[PDB]
Amino acid sequence: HMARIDARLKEINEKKILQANEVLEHLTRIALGQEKEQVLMGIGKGAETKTHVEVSAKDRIKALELLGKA
Template sequence: MVKLTLKQQRFVDEYLITGNATDSAIVAGYSKKYAGQNADKLLKNTKIKTYIDERLKELGDEKIAKQEEILQYLTSIMRGEQTEQILRGMGEGYQQLIDIEVGAKDRIKAAELLGKRYGMWTDKVDIFGEVVFITGDDEIEE
């Protein structure tokens, strides 16, 4: 991680939340006058820019599912290892949240998506036409 002053670090953390450089600089402790005139300079600072990139990568890694995780999840649905919650009426307007097995349609869809991933189903395509080759002598060969 890049070393920043505490004020710069607070600026980046606030900027990642709001996307507003001027307001973020003020919240971080810079004066309103400085923030208004120099917020864009803070964003151009190479250390701050590098820190922003590092933080965005960290946040992205935490929040975005990777390919392996998606494949594992689809496999667990296909195998019936996942449950889903529904509301069941218990009478007199009372409802209870219960867990049920994932339905057959969802399991089939998961299997279909996994099959597509591994190229198990391909469409047959017939291609007809002539191939024309042009040589360096500008003669056409078939």
């Protein structure tokens, strides 16, 4: 199991650590279909380019499962 760090210590950490409520906010954005991911897309003859697509249903369902357990 992951080491649990006091939420007061996460808050005063100079570099950002997400709190429990912020984890759920980010999972919520994914679950609501508001996020994108960068993937490689073919443009002809083996060549590819970077593009952004909506987060897949399998990843939204994983986010929903985690939200349902929280």
